[PDB]
């Protein structure tokens, strides 16, 4: 019925940081406890993302899905007033995140750690000896695009250990390093060392791959074989005239419908559960957005 938290600062803040914090009014940041009054230490994302420890980017995701999000409402010299986000309510939220992505009306938003930069997110409170780190929110189509970019880097950076190859570490940085958008290219900050909990997520992904590879429908494989030669298509333009040798070696036996049918039945059940692995974070639903007002009505 009443959804409000009063975060109290121990020490007055300086006239420059009260001005910086006010630019973030209407932004989400996750607090630790669901209580009416709190300290500043639970406020930001700052403890998981510190300067002294490497950013994992997957322990940070796990911190968001556990916390309780809140919308910053009012800023003063000694306080920060928020309203918590609970399941069965609607909220009015502004688009004020610094690497600027533009939202659509009637779209779904996603919450992810500050992938684009540590400096874009933080408002440093040197008066209270804390750094308040805001999470970055994106439209769902582009948020998944960034999450995939980060995971494949954890593999390929490790696969290419120290290679003098001009091809390596220049292709994996030009492909995975950036995310393009409407008339822009946004660089991602990618970890120098792929840490744990990011590889442990890719271990689970592989287990699904070890299963699916045994039940692939062969009728599917014979179709792509006929199309890469006979017809010309934009989807199959990825494959050149050359055909993957694995398919010719995997698919030898003649097609039987009764087998490819039950192969599809077993496989489809894994994709349904595979989807749970990819969300990895809280999602919002937006019903109205004004290009000029910069205010959505999220649910």
């Amino acid at each position: 019925m009443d959804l409000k938290v009063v975060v109290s600062l121990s020490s007055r803040l300086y006239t420059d940081e009260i001005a910086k914090m006010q630019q973030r009014i209407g932004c989400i940041l996750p607090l630790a406890s669901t209580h009416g009054t709190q300290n500043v230490q639970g406020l930001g994302l700052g403890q998981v993302y510190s300067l002294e420890t490497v950013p994992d980017y997957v322990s940070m995701y796990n911190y968001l899905s556990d916390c309780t999000l809140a919308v910053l409402d009012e800023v003063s010299v000694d306080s920060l007033i928020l309203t918590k986000i609970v399941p069965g309510q609607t909220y009015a939220i502004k688009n004020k995140y610094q690497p600027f992505f533009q939202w659509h009306g009637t779209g779904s938003l996603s919450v992810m750690p500050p992938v684009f930069g540590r400096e874009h997110a933080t408002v440093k409170l040197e008066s209270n000896d804390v750094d308040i780190v805001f999470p970055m929110v994106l439209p769902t189509p582009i948020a998944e695009e960034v999450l995939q970019k980060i995971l494949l880097f954890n593999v390929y950076s490790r696969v290419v250990m120290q290679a003098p190859g001009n091809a390596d570490m220049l292709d994996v940085h030009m492909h995975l390093g950036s995310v393009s958008y409407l008339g822009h290219h946004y660089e991602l900050a990618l970890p120098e060392v792929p840490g744990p909990l990011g590889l442990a997520l890719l271990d689970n992904l592989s287990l699904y791959f070890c299963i699916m590879v045994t039940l692939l429908p062969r009728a599917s494989m014979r179709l792509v074989r006929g199309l890469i030669r006979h017809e010309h298509h934009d989807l199959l333009n990825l494959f050149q005239e050359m055909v993957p040798d694995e398919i010719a070696r995997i698919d030898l036996d003649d097609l039987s419908v009764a087998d490819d049918l039950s192969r599809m039945r077993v496989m489809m059940t894994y994709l349904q559960s595979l989807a749970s692995l990819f969300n990895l974070g809280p999602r919002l639903a937006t019903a109205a957005y004004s290009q000029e007002t910069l205010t959505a009505t999220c649910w």
Binding site: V6, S8, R12, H35, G36, T37, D78, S79
Partner: protein, 49 residues
């Protein structure tokens, strides 16, 4: 104030200090749970002893 000295010492003229102090804010809260059954039978009119 100051003292008058005979030597060539550089005289410190009139001096004043202006100092400012500011307010601090404190908040306090507690939580108490209640049963819907009691909150409801608060409303009803009892028919039997």
């Amino acid at each position: 104030p100051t003292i008058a000295h005979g030597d060539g010492r550089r005289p410190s003229k009139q001096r004043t200090f202006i100092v400012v102090k500011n307010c601090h804010k404190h908040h306090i809260s507690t939580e108490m749970e209640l049963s819907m059954l009691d909150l409801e039978i608060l409303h009803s009119i009892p028919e039997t002893p």
